[PDB]
Protein backbone atom coordinates (compact mmCIF):
# COMPACT_ATOMS: atom_id res chain seq x y z
CA UNK A 1 0.00 0.00 0.00
CA UNK A 2 0.90 3.74 0.94
CA UNK A 3 4.24 4.32 2.68
CA UNK A 4 3.39 7.31 5.33
CA UNK A 5 4.80 9.09 8.35
CA UNK A 6 2.61 10.07 11.16
CA UNK A 7 5.07 12.31 13.23
CA UNK A 8 8.33 14.12 11.45
CA UNK A 9 7.27 13.59 8.01
CA UNK A 10 8.77 16.52 6.70
CA UNK A 11 12.18 14.96 5.28
CA UNK A 12 12.36 15.12 1.12
CA UNK A 13 14.28 11.60 0.43
CA UNK A 14 14.42 7.84 1.17
CA UNK A 15 17.67 6.41 0.75
CA UNK A 16 16.80 2.59 -0.30
CA UNK A 17 19.86 0.90 0.69
CA UNK A 18 20.50 -2.38 -1.35
CA UNK A 19 23.46 -5.19 -0.40
CA UNK A 20 25.12 -6.77 -2.74
CA UNK A 21 24.96 -10.12 -0.70
CA UNK A 22 27.73 -11.75 -1.87
CA UNK A 23 30.09 -8.99 -1.43
CA UNK A 24 28.27 -8.44 2.07
CA UNK A 25 29.37 -11.84 2.85
CA UNK A 26 32.92 -11.97 1.57
CA UNK A 27 33.45 -8.62 3.74
CA UNK A 28 32.48 -9.70 7.31
CA UNK A 29 35.32 -12.58 6.30
CA UNK A 30 37.39 -10.84 5.15
CA UNK A 31 37.24 -8.77 8.27
CA UNK A 32 37.56 -11.83 10.25
CA UNK A 33 33.91 -11.38 11.65
CA UNK A 34 31.74 -14.59 12.83
CA UNK A 35 29.49 -16.01 9.94
CA UNK A 36 25.80 -15.48 10.29
CA UNK A 37 23.47 -18.36 8.90
CA UNK A 38 22.77 -15.65 5.89
CA UNK A 39 26.56 -15.87 4.68
CA UNK A 40 26.95 -19.80 5.09
CA UNK A 41 23.43 -20.60 3.85
CA UNK A 42 23.88 -18.04 0.86
CA UNK A 43 24.35 -20.40 -2.22
CA UNK A 44 24.28 -19.80 -5.67
CA UNK A 45 21.23 -19.11 -7.56
CA UNK A 46 19.87 -18.81 -11.13
CA UNK A 47 19.32 -14.97 -11.06
CA UNK A 48 22.32 -13.46 -9.96
CA UNK A 49 20.56 -10.07 -9.71
CA UNK A 50 18.68 -11.48 -6.68
CA UNK A 51 21.91 -11.63 -4.97
CA UNK A 52 20.96 -7.69 -4.59
CA UNK A 53 18.80 -7.61 -1.05
CA UNK A 54 17.64 -5.04 1.08
CA UNK A 55 19.11 -3.40 3.67
CA UNK A 56 17.43 -0.92 4.40
CA UNK A 57 15.02 2.35 3.71
CA UNK A 58 16.37 5.19 5.37
CA UNK A 59 14.69 8.70 6.01
CA UNK A 60 16.50 11.71 5.35
CA UNK A 61 16.92 14.18 7.97
CA UNK A 62 13.88 15.89 8.55
CA UNK A 63 13.39 19.40 9.21
CA UNK A 64 11.80 18.99 11.89
CA UNK A 65 14.87 17.19 13.48
CA UNK A 66 17.34 19.24 11.97
CA UNK A 67 15.53 22.55 12.97
CA UNK A 68 16.70 21.01 16.55
CA UNK A 69 20.44 21.06 16.06
CA UNK A 70 20.86 17.88 14.12
CA UNK A 71 23.01 17.63 11.29
CA UNK A 72 23.18 14.94 8.18
CA UNK A 73 25.97 13.11 9.86
CA UNK A 74 24.09 12.99 13.39
CA UNK A 75 21.08 11.56 12.12
CA UNK A 76 23.25 9.04 9.61
CA UNK A 77 24.88 7.60 12.88
CA UNK A 78 21.44 7.65 15.14
CA UNK A 79 18.26 8.07 12.66
CA UNK A 80 15.45 7.48 15.59
CA UNK A 81 17.85 7.97 17.91
CA UNK A 82 19.34 11.29 17.70
CA UNK A 83 18.70 13.81 20.72
CA UNK A 84 16.91 15.79 21.18
CA UNK A 85 14.55 14.76 18.92
CA UNK A 86 13.24 12.06 18.19
CA UNK A 87 15.24 10.58 21.02
CA UNK A 88 14.15 7.10 20.98
CA UNK A 89 16.17 4.18 22.21
CA UNK A 90 19.48 3.92 20.27
CA UNK A 91 19.21 0.54 17.39
CA UNK A 92 21.96 -1.65 18.08
CA UNK A 93 23.77 -3.53 15.47
CA UNK A 94 25.29 -5.45 18.43
CA UNK A 95 21.77 -6.60 19.92
CA UNK A 96 19.33 -6.68 17.08
CA UNK A 97 16.85 -8.91 18.38
CA UNK A 98 16.96 -6.52 21.19
CA UNK A 99 15.07 -4.01 19.28
CA UNK A 100 11.24 -4.21 19.68
CA UNK A 101 9.27 -7.11 17.17
CA UNK A 102 8.36 -4.60 14.39
CA UNK A 103 4.57 -6.22 13.94
CA UNK A 104 5.02 -6.54 10.43
CA UNK A 105 2.42 -9.37 9.02
CA UNK A 106 3.81 -12.87 8.38
CA UNK A 107 2.81 -11.99 4.98
CA UNK A 108 4.91 -9.38 4.76
CA UNK A 109 7.58 -11.02 7.01
CA UNK A 110 7.43 -13.88 4.22
CA UNK A 111 8.12 -11.55 1.39
CA UNK A 112 10.69 -9.86 3.37
CA UNK A 113 12.74 -12.43 4.38
CA UNK A 114 12.61 -13.88 0.52
CA UNK A 115 15.22 -9.98 -0.73
CA UNK A 116 16.92 -9.81 2.92
CA UNK A 117 18.29 -12.44 4.33
CA UNK A 118 19.07 -11.03 8.00
CA UNK A 119 15.48 -10.57 8.60
CA UNK A 120 13.69 -12.80 11.45
CA UNK A 121 15.38 -15.61 12.64
CA UNK A 122 18.29 -15.14 14.94
CA UNK A 123 19.59 -11.86 13.06
CA UNK A 124 16.42 -9.61 13.33
CA UNK A 125 17.77 -6.95 10.94
CA UNK A 126 14.14 -5.31 10.00
CA UNK A 127 14.04 -5.09 14.27
CA UNK A 128 16.94 -2.71 13.94
CA UNK A 129 16.21 -1.21 10.87
CA UNK A 130 12.71 -0.41 11.77
CA UNK A 131 13.86 0.85 15.06
CA UNK A 132 16.03 3.47 13.71
CA UNK A 133 14.76 4.59 10.94
CA UNK A 134 10.83 4.16 10.87
CA UNK A 135 9.74 4.11 14.44
CA UNK A 136 9.82 7.49 15.12
CA UNK A 137 7.82 8.17 12.04
CA UNK A 138 5.36 5.78 13.23
CA UNK A 139 5.45 3.96 9.82
CA UNK A 140 2.98 0.71 9.02
CA UNK A 141 5.82 -2.05 8.88
CA UNK A 142 3.82 -3.86 6.04
CA UNK A 143 3.68 -0.54 4.05
CA UNK A 144 7.36 -0.19 4.82
CA UNK A 145 8.94 -3.19 4.65
CA UNK A 146 6.28 -4.16 1.57
CA UNK A 147 7.42 -0.93 0.01
CA UNK A 148 11.80 -1.90 0.46
CA UNK A 149 10.64 -5.64 -1.55
CA UNK A 150 8.97 -3.80 -4.46
CA UNK A 151 11.77 -0.66 -4.92
CA UNK A 152 14.57 -3.76 -4.67
CA UNK A 153 12.47 -5.57 -7.03
CA UNK A 154 11.96 -2.86 -9.75
CA UNK A 155 16.07 -2.36 -9.70
CA UNK A 156 16.95 -5.62 -9.85
CA UNK A 157 14.37 -5.45 -12.84
CA UNK A 158 16.01 -2.42 -14.61
CA UNK A 159 19.39 -2.25 -16.41
CA UNK A 160 21.07 -1.83 -13.47
CA UNK A 161 19.75 -5.74 -11.95
CA UNK A 162 20.58 -6.81 -14.82
CA UNK A 163 24.14 -5.19 -15.73
CA UNK A 164 24.84 -7.00 -11.91
CA UNK A 165 24.25 -9.72 -13.39
CA UNK A 166 25.75 -10.28 -16.80
CA UNK A 167 29.10 -9.22 -15.04
CA UNK A 168 28.92 -11.39 -12.17
CA UNK A 169 32.15 -12.12 -11.28
CA UNK A 170 33.53 -9.46 -13.12
CA UNK A 171 35.47 -6.30 -12.95
CA UNK A 172 33.17 -3.75 -13.97
CA UNK A 173 33.31 0.39 -14.43
CA UNK A 174 31.93 2.90 -12.86
CA UNK A 175 31.60 4.52 -15.88
CA UNK A 176 29.75 0.94 -17.54
CA UNK A 177 27.68 0.70 -14.31
CA UNK A 178 26.56 4.51 -14.40
CA UNK A 179 25.30 3.75 -17.97
CA UNK A 180 23.48 0.84 -17.26
CA UNK A 181 21.39 2.47 -14.36
CA UNK A 182 20.94 5.47 -17.23
CA UNK A 183 20.20 3.49 -19.33
CA UNK A 184 16.64 2.81 -17.35
CA UNK A 185 16.78 6.49 -15.04
CA UNK A 186 18.45 8.61 -17.00
CA UNK A 187 22.14 10.18 -16.63
CA UNK A 188 21.15 13.32 -14.04
CA UNK A 189 19.69 10.58 -11.65
CA UNK A 190 23.52 8.65 -12.11
CA UNK A 191 24.16 10.93 -9.25
CA UNK A 192 21.20 9.34 -6.69
CA UNK A 193 23.52 6.64 -6.61
CA UNK A 194 26.40 6.04 -3.62
CA UNK A 195 28.54 2.70 -4.22
CA UNK A 196 29.91 1.04 -1.40
CA UNK A 197 33.35 -1.75 -2.16
CA UNK A 198 35.20 -3.68 0.40
CA UNK A 199 38.85 -4.79 -0.08
CA UNK A 200 41.90 -4.36 -2.81
CA UNK A 201 40.73 -4.76 -5.68
CA UNK A 202 37.43 -3.23 -4.53
CA UNK A 203 34.11 -5.43 -5.18
CA UNK A 204 30.79 -4.40 -4.78
CA UNK A 205 29.08 -4.63 -1.23
CA UNK A 206 26.04 -2.18 -1.25
CA UNK A 207 24.09 0.15 -3.53
CA UNK A 208 22.27 3.04 -2.08
CA UNK A 209 19.94 5.14 -4.21
CA UNK A 210 18.38 8.82 -2.92
CA UNK A 211 14.68 8.69 -4.11
CA UNK A 212 12.34 11.69 -3.49
CA UNK A 213 10.05 11.49 -0.80
CA UNK A 214 7.25 12.74 -3.07
CA UNK A 215 7.92 9.81 -5.32
CA UNK A 216 8.34 6.71 -2.67
CA UNK A 217 4.80 5.15 -3.03
CA UNK A 218 4.84 4.81 -7.18
CA UNK A 219 7.03 2.90 -9.24
CA UNK A 220 9.93 3.84 -9.93
CA UNK A 221 11.10 6.55 -13.25
CA UNK A 222 13.62 9.23 -14.30
CA UNK A 223 11.42 11.70 -11.95
CA UNK A 224 11.96 9.52 -8.80
CA UNK A 225 15.77 10.01 -7.68
CA UNK A 226 17.58 13.27 -6.19
CA UNK A 227 21.71 13.34 -6.67
CA UNK A 228 23.91 13.31 -3.60
CA UNK A 229 27.56 14.33 -2.91
CA UNK A 230 29.03 10.80 -2.38
CA UNK A 231 29.68 8.65 -5.31
CA UNK A 232 31.07 6.28 -2.85
CA UNK A 233 34.24 4.68 -1.86
CA UNK A 234 34.51 1.85 -5.05
CA UNK A 235 36.70 3.94 -7.29
CA UNK A 236 36.71 3.52 -11.41
CA UNK A 237 36.42 -0.25 -11.05
CA UNK A 238 35.54 -2.86 -9.47
CA UNK A 239 34.68 -6.14 -8.77
CA UNK A 240 30.91 -7.64 -8.42
CA UNK A 241 31.63 -10.45 -6.09
CA UNK A 242 30.35 -14.18 -6.27
CA UNK A 243 29.08 -16.20 -3.99
CA UNK A 244 31.71 -18.19 -2.32
CA UNK A 245 34.75 -16.84 0.00
CA1 LIG B 1 32.76 -13.89 -2.81
Not at 56 to 84: I, N, Q, Y
Not at 100 to 113: F, M, Q, V
Not at 141 to 147: C, E, K
Not at 181 to 204: D, H, I, M, R
Request: hydrophobic content about 35%; proline content about 5%; glycine content about 8%.
Amino acid sequence: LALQAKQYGDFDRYVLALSWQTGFCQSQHDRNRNERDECRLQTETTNKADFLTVHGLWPGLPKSVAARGVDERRWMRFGCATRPIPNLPEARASRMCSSPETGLSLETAAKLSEVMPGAGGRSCLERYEYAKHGACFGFDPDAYFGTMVRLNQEIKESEAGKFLADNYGKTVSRRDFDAAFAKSWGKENVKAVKLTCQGNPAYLTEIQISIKADAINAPLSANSFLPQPHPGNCGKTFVIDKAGY
